[PDB]
Every structure is written in C-alpha cells, then in structure tokens.
Amino acid sequence: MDEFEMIKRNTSEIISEEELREVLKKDEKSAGIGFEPSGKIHLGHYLQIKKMIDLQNAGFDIIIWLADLGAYLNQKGELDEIRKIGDYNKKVFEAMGLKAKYVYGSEHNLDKDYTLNVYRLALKTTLKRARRSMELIAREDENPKVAEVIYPIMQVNAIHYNGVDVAVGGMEQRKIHMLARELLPKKVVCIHNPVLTGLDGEGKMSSSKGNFIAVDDSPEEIRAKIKKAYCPAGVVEGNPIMEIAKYFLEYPLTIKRPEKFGGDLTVNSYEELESLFKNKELHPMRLKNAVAEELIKILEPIRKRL
Amino acid sequence: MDEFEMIKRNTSEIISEEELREVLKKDEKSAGIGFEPSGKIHLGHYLQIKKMIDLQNAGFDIIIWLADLGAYLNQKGELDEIRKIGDYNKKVFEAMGLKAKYVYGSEHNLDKDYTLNVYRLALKTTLKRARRSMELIAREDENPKVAEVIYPIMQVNAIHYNGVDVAVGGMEQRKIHMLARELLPKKVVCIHNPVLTGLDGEGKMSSSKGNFIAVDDSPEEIRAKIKKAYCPAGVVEGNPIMEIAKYFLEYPLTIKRPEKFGGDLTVNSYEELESLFKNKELHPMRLKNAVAEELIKILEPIRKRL
Ligand SMILES: N[C@@H](CC1=C2C=CCC=CC2=CC1)C(=O)O
Numbered sequence: 065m066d067e068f069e070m071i072k073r074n075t076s077e078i079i080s081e082e083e084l085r086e087v088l089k090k091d092e093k094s095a096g097i098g099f100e101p102s103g104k105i106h107l108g109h110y111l112q113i114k115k116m117i118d119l120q121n122a123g124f125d126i127i128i129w130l131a132d133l134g135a136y137l138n139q140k141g142e143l144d145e146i147r148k149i150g151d152y153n154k155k156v157f158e159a160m161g162l163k164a165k166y167v168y169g170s171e172h173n174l175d176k177d178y179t180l181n182v183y184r185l186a187l188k189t190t191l192k193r194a195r196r197s198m199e200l201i202a203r204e205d206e207n208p209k210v211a212e213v214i215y216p217i218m219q220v221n222a223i224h225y226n227g228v229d230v231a232v233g234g235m236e237q238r239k240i241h242m243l244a245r246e247l248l249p250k251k252v253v254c255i256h257n258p259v260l261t262g263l264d265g266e267g268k269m270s271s272s273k274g275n276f277i278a279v280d281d282s283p284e285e286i287r288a289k290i291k292k293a294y295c296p297a298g299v300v301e302g303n304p305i306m307e308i309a310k311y312f313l314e315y316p317l318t319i320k321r322p323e324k325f326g327g328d329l330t331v332n333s334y335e336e337l338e339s340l341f342k343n344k345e346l347h348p349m350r351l352k353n354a355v356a357e358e359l360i361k362i363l364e365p366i367r368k369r370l
Numbered sequence: 371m372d373e374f375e376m377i378k379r380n381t382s383e384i385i386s387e388e389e390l391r392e393v394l395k396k397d398e399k400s401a402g403i404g405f406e407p408s409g410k411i412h413l414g415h416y417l418q419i420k421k422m423i424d425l426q427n428a429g430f431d432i433i434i435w436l437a438d439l440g441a442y443l444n445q446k447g448e449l450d451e452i453r454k455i456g457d458y459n460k461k462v463f464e465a466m467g468l469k470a471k472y473v474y475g476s477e478h479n480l481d482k483d484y485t486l487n488v489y490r491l492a493l494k495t496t497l498k499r500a501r502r503s504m505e506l507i508a509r510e511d512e513n514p515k516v517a518e519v520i521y522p523i524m525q526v527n528a529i530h531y532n533g534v535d536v537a538v539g540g541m542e543q544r545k546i547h548m549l550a551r552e553l554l555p556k557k558v559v560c561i562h563n564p565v566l567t568g569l570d571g572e573g574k575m576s577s578s579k580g581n582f583i584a585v586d587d588s589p590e591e592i593r594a595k596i597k598k599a600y601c602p603a604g605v606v607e608g609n610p611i612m613e614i615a616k617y618f619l620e621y622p623l624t625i626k627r628p629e630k631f632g633g634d635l636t637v638n639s640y641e642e643l644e645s646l647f648k649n650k651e652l653h654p655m656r657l658k659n660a661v662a663e664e665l666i667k668i669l670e671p672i673r674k675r676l
Pocket residue numbers: 097098099100129131133134135169201215218219220222237
C-alpha cells in the first residue's frame with residue numbers, strides 16, 4: 065500500500081506491520097509522540113517529526129506530548145523553566161510544517177483519574193521491568209531515584225490517556241512501549257525511528273555533548289559543524305554525514321567538482337551516494353560541503369518561520 | 371539546477387552539458403525528436419517520449435516529427451500507409467501525456483525551400499559519412515539504395531528547419547546528430563537516450579524482431595512476455611528486466627514476497643534493486659512479477675485512451 069510504504073520508510077521497526085495494516089483501514093486514526101522539552105531541537109527531533117508528518121498525510125490525527133513533568137522526574141530542572149522550553153519546542157515543531165494537537169503533560173498528568181491509573185499501573189509493573197525500560201533514557205545518577213521508575217508508567221498511561229492507535233518514538237523508547245502493549249487493554253502499534261549518530265562519531269545526537277545540528281542553526285554554524293564532523297573515507301556505518309544524506313537530503317543531487325577530479329557527480333539516490341563513498345570515488349570533504357549546503361537548503365523554511 | 375538534473379536523468383549522453391546550460395537561460399527554447407512511424411509503439415518509444423516530457427517541464431516547446439518520408443526512404447512500405455500509422459502514433463504520444471506540436475514530414479519535407487536546403491547539405495556531406503551515419507538505422511540491404519544517403523540529409527535539415535535548440539534521439543541517432551552539429555551554422559544540443567535491450571536479450575527492442583512490450587499490450591501479454599524474458603539471476607548488464615526497472619518504475623517500491631523467501635522487500639531506489647539482484651537477494655521470478663505488475667499499472671492509462 066502507498067500509505068504503508070510511506071509510513072515504513074526509514075523506520076527501525078514497526079510493532080507490528082500486520083496490526084498497522086489494520087489501523088490504516090479505519091476511518092479515524094491517531095498517533096502520538098512525546099518529547100522531554102529540549103533547549104536545542106536537532107535533526108534527531110526532526111527525523112521523528114518527519115515521521116509524524118507521514119502519518120498526518122495518511123489520515124492520522126497527530127498529538128505531540130510535551131513531557132514537562134517527565135523531564136522533571138528525569139532531573140532536567142524545575143517545572144517553570146521546562147515549560148518555557150516546551151513553548152519554544154512547540155514553536156519549532158510547527159515551523160517544521162506539522163499541524164497537530166500540542167498538549168502539555170502537566171496540564172493532564174496530574175488530574176485525579178490520571179494519577180490513579182498511574183498507581184494502578186504501578187501495581188502491574190515490576191521494578192526490574194521499570195528499571196530496564198529507563199536504561200537509555202534516565203539521566204545518569206549514582207543514586208537512582210524513585211522518580212526514575214515512575215517516569216515509564218506515566219509514559220505508558222499517556223498512550224492510554226491519548227487513545228491513539230499508533231505510538232511513535234526513537235528506538236530508545238522500545239522497552240517502555242513494549243510495557244504499554246502488555247499492560248494496557250488495547251495493544252498500541254509502535255513505530256520506532258533510528259537513533260542518529262552524533263557528529264563526532266561518539267554516541268547519539270543530543271542537546272548535551274554538542275555533537276548535533278540544530279534545525280535553526282545558521283548557515284555558518286551548519287558548515288563549521290559539518291566541516292569537522294566524523295567522516296572517514298570509505299566508511300558508511302557510524303558515519304553521521306552519510307546518515308544525514310540518507311534521512312534528510314532530497315534526490316537527485318549534484319556534487320560539483322572540477323574535471324581534474326572526475327567532474328560533476330549526479331547522484332540519483334542515497335544508495336548511489338553510498339556506493340561512490342564506499343569506493344573512495346568521493347573525497348570526504350567534498351561530501352561534507354555538499355551535504356552542508358543541501359542541509360542549509362532543507363532547513364531554510366524552518367528558519368524563516370521562526 | 372533541478373531542471374538540468376531532471377533532463378539528464380537516464381540519458382546516455384548530452385552533447386554538451388555546457389551548451390545545454392546556456393539553452394536553459396533563454397526565455398524560449400525548443401526540442402525535437404522524430405520517429406519513423408511504427409505499427410507497434412513499445413517501451414523503446416516510451417522512454418524517448420518520457421524524456422520529451424522532462425524537457426517540456428523544463429520550459430521547452432516540444433516538436434514531434436513523424437518521419438513518414440524518412441520511413442519511406444528506409445524501406446518501410448508505401449508512403450500512404452506510413453502516414454496513417456503516424457496518425458496512430460500521434461494518438462499514442464498524446465495518450466502518454468505529451469502535449470506537443472505534431473508535424474508530418476511530407477507536409478514540410480517537399481516544399482521548394484526545404485528541398486533546396488536538402489541539396490545544399492548534400493554538397494557538404496560525403497557519401498562515406500552519410501553511409502556511416504546509417505549503420506544502425508538502415509534496414510538491412512545487400513544492394514544499398516541512394517535513398518539510404520538522402521535519409522540522413524533529411525534528418526539534419528529537419529533539425530535546422532524546426533529551429534530547435536535541442537535534438538533528442540536514441541544513441542543510434544548520434545552520428546546523424548553529430549553530422550548536424552558540423553553542417554548547420556548553429557551547433558544544436560544533442561540528448562541521446564539509451565537503447566533498450568530486447569526481452570530475449572538478443573539485441574535492441576524492435577517491433578521487427580518480436581521482443582518488445584507494446585504500450586497497448588494487455589496485462590496477459592505483458593505478463594507472458596515478461597515471464598519468459600532474458601533475466602539470469604545476478605546478471606544486471608544486458609538484462610532487459612533490470613533496464614525496465616531502471617527506466618520506467620517509480621521508487622521507492624515494494625516487492626511482495628512470502629515470509630519463507632524473506633518477506634516483503636522495500637526498495638528505496640533502482641541502485642538498491644541493483645545491489646539486491648547482483649547479490650542474489652532477489653530471485654528473477656520476484657523481479658519479473660513485480661516489473662510486470664508495475665508496468666501494467668504504468669501503461670494502463672495509455673491503454674485506455676486507445
Ligand atoms: N520518553 C520520552 C519522553 C516522553 C514522556 C515522559 C513522561 C511521561 C509521559 C509521556 C511521555 C511521552 C514521551 C523521551 O525520551 O523524550
């Protein structure tokens with residue numbers, strides 16, 4: 065199906081494709097993703113919002129859950145300062161061309177009936193299971209707090225509370241979402257997107273450890289950031305520059321180079337770019353320059369609307 | 371930038387890319403291709419019309435030259451019958467969605483001023499050169515006729531007469547088009563498309579040999595013809611089914627396969643299809659069936675309007 069192909073494109077996994085095919089037959093359907101409000105919104109966020117846009121075009125009503133209370137339980141600061149960031153994040157997400165219901169957790173996460181359901185789920189969730197679900201999400205702490213195990217069941221309940229057919233997130237959301245499928249009466253279809261590699265080649269991209277491209281970065285910031293990113297010749301796996309070409313660039317694409325080096329390169333797909341680089345037919349710096357300029361031409365509509 | 375990329379896509383050569391860029395700067399610009407009227411219009415023809423549609427979307431005015439007199443000089447029968455076939459070809463080309471100025475050669479090829487220029491060019495064209503330009507075009511004849519060397523002079527003059535900036539044709543047209551660049555006062559930009567391999571892998575796709583997919587073939591004939599086409603596992607060069615996937619199918623596309631043979635296959639681009647087939651991750655059967663069904667869904671709007 066056309067819709068199914070467009071949804072699956074560039075996903076790490078769908079749990080399950082069979083169930084997703086059933087959701088697509090319905091007349092009304094909805095999908096939700098949530099984010100701990102972040103000071104800088106980077107390509108990691110943009111990749112996921114792109115996936116939410118795909119669902120919108122397939123007839124899904126979209127909810128964005130700004131998990132300000134979740135960020136609080138995960139030691140990201142005080143609530144009023146997280147709300148300020150969440151307002152900015154809502155600004156950015158609309159600039160990406162997503163029109164969705166933007167909901168703040170704290171405005172719904174503390175009502176009488178929501179809280180009781182969290183405690184019902186706490187009866188259903190083992191500590192071991194809750195601990196393991198936060199392995200990739202919990203901010204480091206040498207004395208892990210009780211708030212760390214309340215966080216995942218709150219995320220399970222938002223899925224229940226939102227009534228969505230589809231839950232979207234990064235692969236690090238895998239085990240929390242697997243919990244929601246067991247504990248909630250309705251099984252939710254889970255779409256997980258890949259984790260972007262940081263520009264310095266060490267771990268994922270993230271607001272902390274400045275190894276990211278923000279969607280509102282200036283053309284000068286993007287070039288410099290990409291100029292010095294991790295990118296060994298002939299190396300595709302773990303290469304953040306190739307990931308950006310795979311997930312954000314529009315094809316066909318032209319690499320201009322003098323005839324002394326081969327002449328201009330018309331690249332009709334990402335796979336053709338992968339072949340050129342693997343065969344050392346394209347020097348890393350010419351790769352970086354082209355990707356940076358393309359990215360600038362892709363993030364420009366976002367910059368203007370902000 | 372994007373216009374040039376769309377024009378160059380799936381061409382064998384452009385003579386020259388530099389000149390083509392100057393053409394794109396003009397407010398008005400025109401392109402011409404001509405066809406000896408053919409009883410069966412097959413994918414070989416469709417490939418070329420697709421390229422004319424690409425030029426149209428880049429701001430080119432399009433001229434289709436139905437070469438009834440050329441087909442006459444090339445031993446295709448009576449002039450009266452050839453013209454009728456050109457009428458049918460004009461319908462087919464319109465059914466392909468090309469809105470163009472359709473011209474019949476004989477309605478222009480016999481005017482006194484046209485003929486006099488034919489003879490001007492005949493002074494400038496050596497016999498050996500005109501004969502060489504027809505190596506791949508002339509119907510086989512062990513007693514070659516004078517009509518064989520008048521044919522290329524008429525095609526050279528049609529370019530001049532049409533006043534086009536761009537001349538389009540198959541790679542077998544390249545010696546004639548290179549002749550026109552030498553003889554005419556203004557160098558014309560030549561865009562050459564590849565020669566499709568016939569379904570039996572034996573040669574070009576020709577109605578004359580019975581190894582083609584007609585754009586009005588029924589789904590049965592398409593399936594039957596493709597089911598028994600040349601398509602060895604792992605062989606891309608010279609494989610007509612891979613060429614059809616390269617030049618006609620829309621990517622990304624999904625190949626349906628049972629889970630005992632891996633499950634559904636998402637193919638982001640032809641280059642990925644190449645890698646999969648080259649490495650024998652996709653069996654010829656699955657390739658052939660997918661190509662036949664996509665092709666059926668591609669030629670179907672053409673089939674109805676006839
Ligand atoms: N785990 C997500 C943050 C989210 C949440 C946090 C707490 C509670 C409820 C719902 C949530 C939805 C998304 C991340 O890693 O940003």
